[PDB]
Design a protein around this ligand. Structure first.
Ligand code: GA9
Ligand code: GA9
Ligand code: UMP
Ligand code: UMP
Ligand code: 2BR
Lengths: 264, 264
């Protein structure tokens, strides 16, 4: 899509050359922001084929708060395999913080229920926030949260959300990340009887890996196509009762997929 | 400043009529970002006179990590008076989280020292972050953090920083907030022997109060003037050893101050 391709081009034109944790070099920029009016269509990249299966399962998995990959495995979703230990545990990553942020006094805070309580009883609140950046638990996590913190906003009967992504691989991760949060907004909006507003993506270290340059130029040579439409075939009794089959993408006609390998 | 006036105009043209904490109505937008190349001069608004005295004392106070207002009072800084209790305590706000974030196991994490350690040993890290959004301690704070978290970035020998502000009164608080963080970047850069890069400001609920409309129109009618230059007269042995007198602003020639009252 337009916003995405503009960012890719920006990284190419303005990015500075610098490596990553003892590894592949990158071109990076710091601080960028894109806005997607969800009423204009579901923001699933069209300049390359993207699959939503893993994205949907991962989101349902996050919402359940259990950080063991068992559920992902039961559905043959392997995106977290390289980070899980022999027992399938990842430590207190995303889901754990979203649903059970541990306090110093022994309590566990359900931020998702909190946000829903706020959207229902105090929609104009300026602190409808969910943070996964639990400083005291970073060392126990298989990896530090990338999509670290998001905030909701309501105006004119529409639900908007802004995500702060501290680090972003523009080619591989960004499309996935945008789709994931767009889905969450639709789900939250359905549960609150609200229309969807804007999804605002804000990035920190936004980069392109040196070995994805040809892939980037190829995708930039393609014209974005009309965005698909997200359909939720059922209204669950709560944000925790959604099922994989409840989602359907309509009118998605992307260009062919583009493979982008990674170093180890 | 150009960026600041543009945001102010944006709120006026695109803002939605939204009410706030049972009180004064506002015009608000959600999600915006501004960039200040600190190499172009210190970002202290010139379309209205702004005083840095309280801003400097508050930052030094944040860095010391003590949340009692005693130090502020010793220097006749009264900006936190309305939120402090009879003993002058504010609960675990900003400073406490920056310097002693409590973990579930009883430890207290010094995020400022952590960040300095990162800038010195691993400047390319994509997780040089400080967060004041401690979910488990929000209820104990006099007020929920507004400038909720920030991230540093290093490229070409320059230090940049991006702040996420969840809520922002564009007229009264923003100028203060921008100056505060710009000062922090200068201090951090001096300690790490780096040049100053960009300060990126990202906002959540960005608004203008209905009773500040005349004041806004007045400031918008004024032409911004060349930005001043920040001078640090001494290089302390550490980020915690700065003193009020170490700072000096050169070439600040602003338009007259504009008073903006608040309801109670
Ligand atoms: O670990 C991943 O893997 C894939 C991946 C795909 C092809 C490829 O060449 C490489 Br490298 C990686 C991924 C994505 C969806 C899937 O259904 C499967 Br399976 C795998 C992936 C693509 C895009 C974003 C991803 C993010 Cl944000 C996290 C983890 C993965 C990830
Ligand atoms: O609590 C404040 O007060 C002042 C303030 C000034 C005039 C006025 O009409 C009203 Br209302 C409030 C402020 C600012 C600097 C000072 O030296 C002193 Br004293 C007071 C203020 C101005 C701009 C930003 C502020 C922020 Cl972000 C926090 C707290 C204050 C604050
Ligand atoms: O949702 C995600 C998850 C991971 N990554 C990327 C970011 C970096 O490319 C790499 C992680 O490196 P660090 O930021 O942790 O240093 O994986 C993303 O872009 N988006
Ligand atoms: O650094 C600061 C501190 C406070 N405020 C403002 C934001 C809102 O105008 C009000 C706080 O309202 P809530 O976000 O808490 O609802 O004070 C700022 O703009 N900047
Ligand atoms: O395989 C797919 C194709 C299009 C959209 C989602 C999936 Br998953």
């Amino acid at each position: 899509m337009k916003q995405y391709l503009e960012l890719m081009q920006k990284v190419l034109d303005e990015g500075t050359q610098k490596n990553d944790r003892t590894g592949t070099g990158t071109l990076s920029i710091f601080g960028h922001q894109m806005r997607f009016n969800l009423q204009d269509g579901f923001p699933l990249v069209t300049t390359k084929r993207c699959h939503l299966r893993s994205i949907i399962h991962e989101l349902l998995w996050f919402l359940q708060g259990d950080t063991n990959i068992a559920y992902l495995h039961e559905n043959n979703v392997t995106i977290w395999d390289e980070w899980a230990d022999e027992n399938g545990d990842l430590g207190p990553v995303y889901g754990k913080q979203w649903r059970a942020w541990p306090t110093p006094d022994g309590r566990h805070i359900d931020q998702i229920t909190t946000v829903l309580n706020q959207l229902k009883n105090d929609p104009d609140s300026r602190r409808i926030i969910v943070s996964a950046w639990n400083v005291g638990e970073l060392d126990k996590m298989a990896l530090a949260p990338c999509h670290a913190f998001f905030q909701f906003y309501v105006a004119d009967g529409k639900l908007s959300c802004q995500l702060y992504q501290r680090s972003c691989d523009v080619f591989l991760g960004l499309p996935f990340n945008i789709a994931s949060y767009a889905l969450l907004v639709h789900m939250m909006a359905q549960q609150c009887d609200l229309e969807v507003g804007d999804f605002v993506w804000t990035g920190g270290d936004t980069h392109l890996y040196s070995n994805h340059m040809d892939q980037t130029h190829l995708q930039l040579s393609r014209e974005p196509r009309p965005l698909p439409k997200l359909i939720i075939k059922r209204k669950p009794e709560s944000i925790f009762d959604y099922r994989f089959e409840d989602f359907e993408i309509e009118g998605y006609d992307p260009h062919p997929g583009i493979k982008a390998p990674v170093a180890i």
